[PDB]
Symmetry: C3
Subunit: 385 residues, 3 copies
């Protein structure tokens, strides 16, 4: 495994930084020089891995095409910054997050092997063709048919005309998918010659403290859309509403950076309110976990053996909700409606059902069997001379 | 000649980065080492040139004296960062944007030639004295006579006591003016022993996303407020109002960065609306161009041979509007008061008038004759050993 | 002596940057390699010193426990950035601001001497034991059961379990305190085997634009709150009211970047108003200085021999106000309550009282005797190899 040059590229967004931290640390511990290109705003997390931070300015922070336009601008701006950074310091292999595909373009120009690191499930080969009509239902908007023209023009300018705008990005050379197969929708339609389901990349055990039950709390709940974004005030009060007059339960509600006030000047020991909680520490001793369905929270709930109440909002979240529902460990709620009775029902049932608990035990064993960081590091070292 | 070290210094502001991009790229293509010092927020544009990014922290983002205070802070902060970056890596020549005159101070301290790169027209040798009372009649405010004292003190602190606060900044040793002489007010008062009118610095067209005329469109119009920030929602509706019931014409409206909200239900088939358009690509098929009168849009409208309807607001835009009006290729409107009937009239006259078209052909010919990037690069290379 | 590598670490806040600029410049002027690790937002001040800027991303930008969490995150984020930057370029000594104690953790791992640079007075080792109940009465909030415990866990990760979370931070090996002893509360309870009172670190008589006196002003006054930020417009009206009635005085009022919205008339010829003035330059010709009591402003008024009217607002300013009042060179006012009559008396009396002028002359003499930048640089060079 001759020490070689490994270049990791990602973006500052939280869901694209944490999933691969322990994988990068393992590559450093094996004697390789690892450079990590990301925005300096996440220099703390990058440097803690032990990798060389290679700073670049990220352009990432309403319309559907507008969201695609911002992502294209970041790719256009990202590529020259990596080229200047690595021109005289070329790596043996390029690792890149799903949103850092400009790194693949650089690898193709220099004849260097590249590996995609997917922080969540990938799009199946039948899923691409199924979404092809929406592409033509985007070219009649004069905005969607200028975005793709700009995208194809950028690929031609960047020295890779013989590849599709879909193939580049969503059809990598080789890819490491950091979710287990049972959290990947339509996994049988995913070609495992190309994609490898690794599962999460973990490392011994995290620190930042502990969190034990308040005495006389029989069942513990964590409600946190805390992967990143929260803002739904009416639903939060319903959570305190449900757990009010419900003793033996302890609600640990995380309302998030955007709120801190709004509470009720007192509040029983039944409800404790934070803007941030050590989610792993609370999840280790919790009996139910309410979440938005982000892959990071679900995999953390899975690893801790805690059933989940999923309230999907964005695009990755509904599919995640169906998966854990199909695994018999979760219920799906609709943030638009939901009642305290329906909320309390999903909460009280999930914590009592012993069949749910046995399924978490099995999924916990299936989770590790996917290989984790040790399997991923061996597969990356395979690409080194 | 022989490969040397060329140091370019500019600021992140939009009008001070784009005008010289192709000039720096041309200097790199000639085998020179070109370092480009700018704020990391524009690292994408700097690196794409092929130049070595040399980061420094910019202090650039109320009142007139308040505006003068921030610009002085940036000059005070810029000089030590350039000194530290170039202390042991001194270049053969210093190139600096008009707002990066601290680079000239470094060149004077180190006996290095310096060249000012002006992205628009410079201040004439007599236009200053008409404002000289206002400058001296502002030294009556204890704000104008402490700011200059701060400016004068900084010159003494920086090792250049033998120069006026006006001379350094507004009287460079050598300067490259990136506009044609016919876009420079009072050109006869510009000493061309010192300033050289280069015109815009171009280098082929990078496509950036093509835009073909819609089939069955007689003449195409582009509405985009020229060079920097926009906010005019009511004028946007009048544009859609005018081009509604104006068939055979195709309106390409750019609503711009911010405040995009406030669409209009269906939008007629005549009007297609974007937040950003490839302005060079659209101007290639345009027959009239509505703009704010920024030098960037005007020079881009000139190069494409497209008559312009100019709606100046602040800064350079009123003077720029008179220039293109004096050239017989543009009409000036007041966005607050223009009426829908007058808008279609100014538009329909400009696109139909063949005398306007002939003047544009001549102005296109005059534009190239100023030399462009090839002349600018040749003049810069003369300052190399 | 022999040129070595000195690494300074600080934070972007203004009161943690200016106090040590001239000290770093002196260490550079003495032929040493000085690296200065700070956030790039403050790169201008770092580079002007002449030191090598070592950039790291700072997480520093109501509730007692909430403030403690944000400071811990920045310390947690700072340490790996410092380790990566200095791992193969290790310094002979680590200099660190009070808020950059992760540099001390780095120095302990590498067996390197470290020196704390305190920009203001330190906490005597009796106030902490007095603060032990507040520590005990803060662990009862279920926020009180996650934060410090996270801090203790962080020490174990960083390789320093054999040190307390309080002792590390507030009990350095060696410390340079950049205030004189008469501006340090409970100075006798401060162990000077560990802490050294240096006084401010100065360097020549600067410009900042300079400021000549207007003719026909008998005595000049400068009004500028704390050492940076304010938001209280109403107090400003009383200042011009008091002076626009003393035609013999010349007021130089600093309203601050965070206002400008709202003035009064065209302004009398007695009053000149800015959002920012060269405070050192105005102090050259001033006869009274109104301030909130920030340590930066107080030491500048003290060094200029200018009596002060102190209007404390946030933390440290009342204790600083208490100090300068006890020294017989200042009067204390409450911006919320003070009236024009009490304000005008404090201004004219302080400027007229010759006993105050004599006390200022003596304190300025006491100021220099603490050693300043030359003493501090000599003490740092002692930790360097011969």
């Amino acid at each position: 495994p001759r020490p070689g040059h490994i270049a990791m590229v990602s973006v500052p967004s939280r869901g694209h930084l944490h999933p691969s931290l322990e994988l990068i640390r393992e590559l450093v511990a094996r004697g390789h020089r690892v450079t990590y290109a990301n925005d300096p705003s996440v220099a703390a997390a990058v440097t803690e891995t032990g990798a060389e931070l290679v700073p670049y300015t990220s352009a990432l922070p309403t319309d559907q095409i507008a969201q695609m336009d911002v992502f294209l601008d970041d790719a256009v701006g990202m590529l020259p910054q990596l080229r200047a950074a690595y021109e005289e310091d070329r790596p043996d292999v390029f690792l890149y997050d799903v949103l850092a595909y400009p790194a693949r373009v650089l690898a193709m120009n220099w004849g260097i092997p590249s590996i995609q690191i997917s922080p969540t499930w990938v799009m199946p080969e039948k899923y691409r063709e199924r979404m092809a009509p929406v592409v033509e239902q985007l070219k009649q908007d004069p905005r969607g048919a200028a975005h793709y023209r700009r995208f194809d023009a950028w690929l031609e300018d960047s020295g890779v005309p013989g590849i599709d705008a879909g193939d580049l990005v969503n059809l990598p050379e080789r890819s490491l998918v950091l979710v287990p197969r049972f959290l990947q929708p339509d996994a049988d339609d995913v070609d495992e010659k190309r994609f490898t389901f690794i599962g999460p990349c973990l490392g011994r055990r995290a620190h930042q403290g502990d969190w034990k039950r308040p005495a006389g709390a029989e069942k513990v709940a964590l409600v946190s859309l805390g992967s990143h974004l929260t803002n739904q005030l009416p639903f939060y009060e319903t959570c305190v509403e449900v757990f009010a007059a419900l003793p033996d339960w302890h609600l640990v509600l995380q309302i998030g950076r955007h709120v801190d006030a709004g509470e009720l000047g007192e509040l029983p020991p039944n409800v404790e309110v934070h803007n941030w909680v050590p989610q792993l520490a609370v999840l280790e001793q919790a009996d139910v976990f309410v979440t938005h369905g982000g892959m990071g929270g679900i995999q953390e709930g899975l690893f801790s053996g805690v059933p989940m109440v999923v309230a999907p909002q964005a695009n990755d979240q509904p599919a995640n909700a169906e998966s854990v529902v199909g695994l018999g460990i979760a219920r799906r709620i609709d943030i638009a409606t939901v009642t305290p009775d329906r909320l309390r029902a999903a909460v009280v049932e999930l914590a009592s059902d012993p069949a749910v608990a046995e399924r978490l035990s099995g999924l916990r064993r299936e989770l590790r069997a996917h290989g984790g960081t040790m399997r991923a590091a061996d597969l990356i070292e395979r690409q080194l001379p």
